[PDB]
Design a protein around this nucleic acid. Structure first.
Lengths: 100, 206, 68, 72, 84, 8, 62, 48, 142, 140, 141
RNA sequence: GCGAUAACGAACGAGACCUUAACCUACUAAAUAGUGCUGCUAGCAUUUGCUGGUAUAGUCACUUCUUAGAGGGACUAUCGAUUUCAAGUCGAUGGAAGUUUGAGGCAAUAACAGGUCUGUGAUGCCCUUAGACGUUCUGGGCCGCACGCGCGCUACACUGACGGAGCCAGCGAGUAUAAGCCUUGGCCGAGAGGUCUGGGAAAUCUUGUGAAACUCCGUCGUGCUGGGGAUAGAGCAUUGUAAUUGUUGCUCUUCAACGAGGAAUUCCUAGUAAGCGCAAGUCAUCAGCUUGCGUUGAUUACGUCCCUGCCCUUUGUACACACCG
């Protein structure tokens, strides 16, 4: 047995929720007790620049955004089982870190 | 009338509020009546309130202001001239103290004096301008009951504000003198000079 | 103002010319019905279309309407 | 610069206060200043004692406003 | 790191390929009208709902001008411009 | 905008 | 000697800036002698607005 | 008074005795080209 | 409570060659003396055991001499050095607190001492301009 | 356990969570009696849900609220809403619904904000001005 | 019923604990209380020169009572106010550190406080005993 | 949009759309959120109660508040008036929400001698190219002061200043062998600040950012006064290689105009205006500035074309580089 934490971060929620559900799915048919996923409060990375490359015109501003969504999943399983779950649910957008 | 024993003890005076809702738990709306048929529907005293602070939505529709309590409309007009905008608790304190001063003076019901000062302060005919693109022209027109009521509150608080400026007399007791004098129709009070001066000019335009 | 546009006015009257027997004078029933009759991309447009179809249905019962 | 309110209490004003303040419908800090020509600070101490001496009944208590009345 | 090169399936539907292809034609001296219509018809031939080509600059004249060469149906405002 | 003139 | 006249019909906005309204008034007592008069403030029907002088009609304002 | 530090303490500020100028604004056909090189129709015809 | 007195009030006081209104409260009456601010006058009154609830004229001569003694000798009455007007004096390096007539004299002596060495700060004092680096383009219009 | 209902009232940002258990007439604000809620001049705003129905309704219930967020005035309005909603929610679950409809009538007939949270929120600020609608002063 | 600190108004509880704590006399008052300003944002020293230190210690004790291990830096933030910057806008500035640190040190050796684990200063075993006592002797009148 | 109709039926733009805010005791879970219970534990009355602390093993329970994903919900819904009985509008009732539900993002057909080659290893041409107009080093300037003007910040006091006490937000940011991030807690120091440890690459720590107005109790008492805090002197620290032409911060002292502002003129219709602060950006240091955020929170319309700009129709034209003709 091993208390293992899996942290999921990505910018887009569709691939994030697929990986999140897929990990939960593999922790269900395998009789592994789980806690999660925990939807962490999303982070809005905001950058407000001036539209004008020069300094002439009405003072108009862009407001760019970069939402970061974070999910943490707690697993009680041996380390070999949890790591192979990660390769099952590998997605280009979502990065995975595994901590005991 | 029975005194209700709670685990959290409740003061005697506030338990008396179960019988009746009174302004600041001191002033009753039951014996208050508007001595003018034309402003009954625009001076709202039928729904009693404890404190003149309701934080309601009276600016959404057109005539919702007529549904705001008359004392709350009065305390709203006190907080003016920049440094007082948004200071409603200060305004409520002034009104609460003003009513007590209006009570020790003339001994009447303080909110009755407030109602009397409002009916006597709204000009019944104001001379609107009909200037044709710059030239000076004035025409005498009638004044709606809503504008008649809310110009009384505007004039009553403006007069109280200026009487307390650079004066040792406090604003609460400048308002009490302003409200008491206008209630009895005395021309000494501000907002009665203004009301007379408005209706005097309107007489010279019809 | 609350003036409905042409994308909702003409699409709603196509429903009446096509599914009058299945329609009714109830918005809630119409709202569910138009979700199985038309492919609406957004819920807000679905409610607007069903809300105007109900108004037209309520008006047909009071007499003949022009254009439908 | 015309106020010149009295801030020191002599004997002529002291008994004048106790003979005149009771015959008032409403007394306060400004009322004492306005009509007795005494200063505001002297008015505040006069009110706090006149209440202790029983001449004056406290209608309402507040720091910024003191509403008082006759006790007779 | 491993790099793989993959061919774009629909050259007519890739504005990057069409812009690079158009640039390789304009730098060869081909006239703008003949060059612009070579991508207008190539985009439609691939099945595009719409296509618009704008070429701006100066061409044998001191004053500069811009010419738009549209085709088909184009949407301009709202979210769908980010999708289609 | 100016003509650099030397002294040394 | 003020007279009270309930309004029964709001005719329309008049005056140069639209700040004055034509209205149709009806007297509280002697429910006749209906007059058209101009009013400054906002007006609904059934306003008991009183008239300092009654013997005067109203027309459009310039 | 060769050094500027020594002379500064001896020069008086005689500024309040002279009056400011009455006006001091010192900062036009944009439509008419001033290049003087008109474009012939042949050049536009060949380019575009 | 209100108390009365006769003949003891002094309408005009004269301290350090400065006329003091006797009906002003003592802490703020002493602020008329140049070089004595509210913060300094508040402390000398507490060091002299003069309760602040007294007007200037209420004070007796015994208290008045006790105050002028403290203001002229602050360090001798456990007044901190950092609280003083003129600390680390230029010539003798001791902590001082200049008063009514001494203040403008030693303020002057600082100006020539700056002007004698012809420092930039001393020069700008001579011209009547702002010396602490303030911009004078648009506000020096007095 | 016992007869417990948990509710909440809201103003602009202030939110007051009320726990209503069966007991004696205990009514606390953050562990402190309601008779000393500040500011004093708005103390009757929280007395309204009490005196409107009569304190006899609170014999069998004890109320402990925890109010956080918002401001001084906004917290008072959150508390009075939590009390009024808490009393109603207890009646709906452990008393006949006839009384709950009775309680809801007096509260609603007096002030809508006693039961319905005010939906007004602060408008976002837009560039080109110091406020939501206000703009920088223009000069010619 | 058991009276607690939370059952008595703060303003008149502090006025009662300050009077008791001064008459008890065991609280050690530093020698600069007649000189110092409470905060750098203040412009004048407290008007109640003889008693201001006692009342502030009473306020500090009550404030620590209702919370858990509040430090002295938080106390500077608590008693700080808006500074009167001349033409620039107002700003929040913390109160003086020594006055608060001396108060908690004075209260810690009088038996009301102690160093709490993981920082701050908890209220003492006897700190509850004597504050809750003053609360009872505050509201009987 | 209704309608009138030599037009009929359409497309772009508007609207739809997307992001955000408001509702959900209805789902899905949460030791990086909260609560009730339960252990253990404290104080006060002893009534079994009331406030706490503790519990990453009490190896509890739950999702109401908190977080976020899947959805639901509003479509002007129902009912009265008016209307060409049409589009609609105005009133009520219900509702979380009935101003396009609030706010934004995106945004047509052409075009401007609008602004930038001082953002670009974006650029054509002209100029310069070794005593350089390249690059770098040192010092100064961009701040310079008889003046006119604009964006703002403090104020002219008592609806206030101080002095104590009460004590409530939201949006965010945060590091490693650096070149040093956010920094609690303890100890010194009147302060500013210094010093020793620890936490945090973060819903975990800074941080409940205990913000300011605000509220209570006192002093002041209409006085250029305890309003206001320029100008200036002396001193103490911080950043930086370097503070002089004061970077900034702190202490004492100095106590200026200003006592509500002419002709004119700006912004604004509801959580809005106005106050009131806070964060992020610039940033070694410096915010009277912007970009946002929240606290307190109104007066007055909810109308018109009277002024002003723009749009449309008719009309005149010797204009079309289009009246700067």
């Amino acid at each position: 047995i091993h208390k293992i934490r899996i942290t999921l971060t990505s910018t887009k929620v569709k691939q994030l929720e697929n990986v999140s559900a897929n990990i939960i799915r593999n922790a269900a048919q395998y009789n592994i007790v789980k806690k999660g996923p925990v939807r962490m409060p999303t982070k809005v990375l905001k950058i407000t620049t001036r539209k004008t490359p020069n300094g002439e015109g009405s003072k108009t501003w862009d407001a760019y955004e970069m939402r970061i969504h974070k999910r943490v999943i707690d697993l009680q399983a041996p380390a070999s089982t949890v790591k192979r779950i990660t390769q099952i649910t590998i997605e280009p957008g979502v990065d995975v870190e595994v901590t005991i | 009338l029975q005194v209700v024993e709670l685990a959290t003890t409740i003061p005697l005076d506030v338990q008396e509020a179960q019988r009746e809702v009174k302004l600041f738990n001191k002033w009753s709306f039951e014996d208050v009546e508007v001595k003018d048929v034309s402003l009954v529907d625009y001076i709202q005293i039928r729904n009693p309130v404890f404190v003149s602070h309701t934080a309601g939505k009276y600016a959404s529709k057109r005539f919702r202001k007529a549904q705001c309590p008359i004392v709350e409309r009065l305390t709203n007009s006190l907080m003016m001239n920049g440094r007082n905008n948004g200071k409603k608790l200060k305004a409520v304190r002034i009104v609460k103290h003003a009513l007590e001063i209006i009570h020790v003076l003339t001994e009447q019901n303080p909110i009755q004096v407030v109602v009397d000062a409002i009916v006597n302060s709204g000009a019944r005919e104001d001379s609107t301008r009909i200037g044709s693109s710059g030239t000076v022209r004035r025409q005498a027109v009638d004044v709606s009951p809503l504008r008649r009521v809310n110009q009384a509150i505007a004039l009553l608080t403006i007069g109280a504000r200026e009487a307390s400026f650079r004066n040792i007399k406090t604003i609460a007791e400048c308002l009490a003198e302003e409200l008491i004098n206008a209630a009895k129709g005395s021309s000494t009070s501000y907002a009665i000079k203004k009301k007379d001066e408005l209706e005097r000019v309107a007489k010279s335009n019809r | 103002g609350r003036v409905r546009t042409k994308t909702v006015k003409r699409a709603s009257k196509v429903l009446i010319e096509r599914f009058y027997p299945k329609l009714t004078l109830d918005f809630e029933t119409n709202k569910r019905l138009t979700s199985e009759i038309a492919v609406i991309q957004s819920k807000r447009l679905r409610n607007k279309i069903a809300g105007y179809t109900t108004h037209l249905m309520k008006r047909i019962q009071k007499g003949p309407v022009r254009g439908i | 610069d015309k106020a010149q309110h009295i801030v020191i209490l002599d004997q002529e004003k002291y008994d004048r206060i106790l003979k005149d303040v009771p015959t008032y419908k409403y007394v306060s800090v400004s009322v004492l200043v306005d009509r007795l020509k005494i200063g505001g600070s002297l008015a505040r101490v006069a009110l706090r004692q006149l209440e202790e001496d029983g001449i004056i009944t406290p209608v309402l208590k507040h720091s910024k406003q003191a509403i008082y009345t006759r006790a007779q | 790191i491993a790099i793989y090169a993959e061919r774009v399936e629909e050259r007519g539907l890739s504005a990057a390929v069409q812009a690079e292809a158009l640039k390789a034609k304009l730098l060869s001296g081909l006239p703008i009208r003949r060059a612009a219509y070579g991508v207008l018809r190539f985009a439609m031939g691939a099945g595009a709902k719409g296509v618009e080509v704008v070429i701006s600059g100066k061409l044998r004249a001191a004053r500069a001008k811009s010419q738009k060469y549209a085709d088909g149906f184009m949407i301009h405002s709202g979210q769908p411009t980010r999708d289609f | 905008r100016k003509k650099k003139v030397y002294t040394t | 000697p003020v007279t009270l006249a309930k309004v029964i019909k709001v005719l329309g906005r008049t005056g140069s800036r639209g700040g004055v309204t034509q209205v149709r008034v009806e007297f509280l007592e002697d429910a006749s002698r209906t007059i058209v008069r101009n009013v400054k403030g906002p007006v609904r029907e059934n306003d008991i607005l009183c008239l300092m002088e009654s013997e005067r009609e109203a027309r459009r304002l310039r | 008074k060769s050094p500027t530090g020594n002379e500064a303490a001896l020069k008086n500020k005689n500024f309040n005795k002279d009056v400011a100028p009455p006006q001091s604004t010192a900062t036009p056909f944009d439509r008419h080209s001033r290049t003087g090189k008109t474009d012939s129709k042949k050049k536009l015809q060949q380019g575009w | 409570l209100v108390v009365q007195e006769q003949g003891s009030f002094q309408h005009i006081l004269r301290l350090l060659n400065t006329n003091i209104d006797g009906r002003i409260k003592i802490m703020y009456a002493l602020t008329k003396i140049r070089g004595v601010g509210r913060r300094y006058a508040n402390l000398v009154c507490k060091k002299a055991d003069v309760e602040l609830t007294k007007r200037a004229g209420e004070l007796t001569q015994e208290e008045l001499e006790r105050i002028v003694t403290i203001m002229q000798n602050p360090t001798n009455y456990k007044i901190p050095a950092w609280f003083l007007n003129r600390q680390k004096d230029q010539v003798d390096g001791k902590d001082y607190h200049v008063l009514a007539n001494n203040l403008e004299s030693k303020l002057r002596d600082d100006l020539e001492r700056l002007k004698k060495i012809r420092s930039h700060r001393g020069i700008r004092h001579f011209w009547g301009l702002k010396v602490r680096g303030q911009h004078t383009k648009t506000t020096s219009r007095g | 356990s016992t007869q417990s209902v948990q509710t909440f009232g809201k103003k602009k940002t202030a939110t007051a969570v009320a726990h209503v258990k069966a007991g004696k007439g205990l009514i606390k604000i953050n562990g402190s009696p309601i008779t000393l809620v500040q500011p004093e001049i708005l103390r009757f705003k929280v007395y309204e849900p009490l005196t409107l129905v009569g304190l006899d309704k609170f014999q069998g219930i004890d109320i402990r609220v925890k109010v956080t967020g918002g401001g001084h005035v906004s917290q008072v309005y959150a508390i009075r809403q939590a009390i009024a909603k808490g009393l109603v929610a207890y009646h709906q679950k452990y008393v006949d619904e006839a009384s709950k409809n009775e309680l809801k009538k007096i509260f609603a007939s007096y002030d809508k904000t006693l039961l319905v949270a005010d939906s007004r929120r602060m408008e976002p600020k837009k560039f080109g001005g110091r406020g939501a609608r206000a703009r920088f002063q223009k000069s010619y | 019923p058991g009276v607690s600190v939370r059952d008595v108004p703060a303003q008149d509880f502090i006025n009662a604990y300050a009077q008791f704590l001064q008459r008890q006399g065991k609280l050690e008052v530093p020698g600069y209380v007649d000189i110092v300003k409470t905060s750098a944002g203040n412009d004048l020293p407290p008007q109640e020169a003889e008693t201001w230190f006692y009342k502030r210690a009473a306020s500090i004790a009550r404030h620590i009572y209702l919370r858990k291990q509040v430090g002295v830096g938080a106390l500077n933030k608590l008693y700080g106010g808006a500074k009167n910057r001349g033409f620039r806008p107002h700003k929040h500035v913390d109160a003086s550190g020594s006055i608060n640190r001396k108060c908690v040190q004075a209260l810690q050796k009088i038996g009301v406080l102690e160093i709490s684990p993981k920082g701050g200063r908890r209220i003492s075993e006897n700190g509850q005993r004597d504050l809750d006592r003053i609360a009872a002797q505050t509201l009987e009148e």
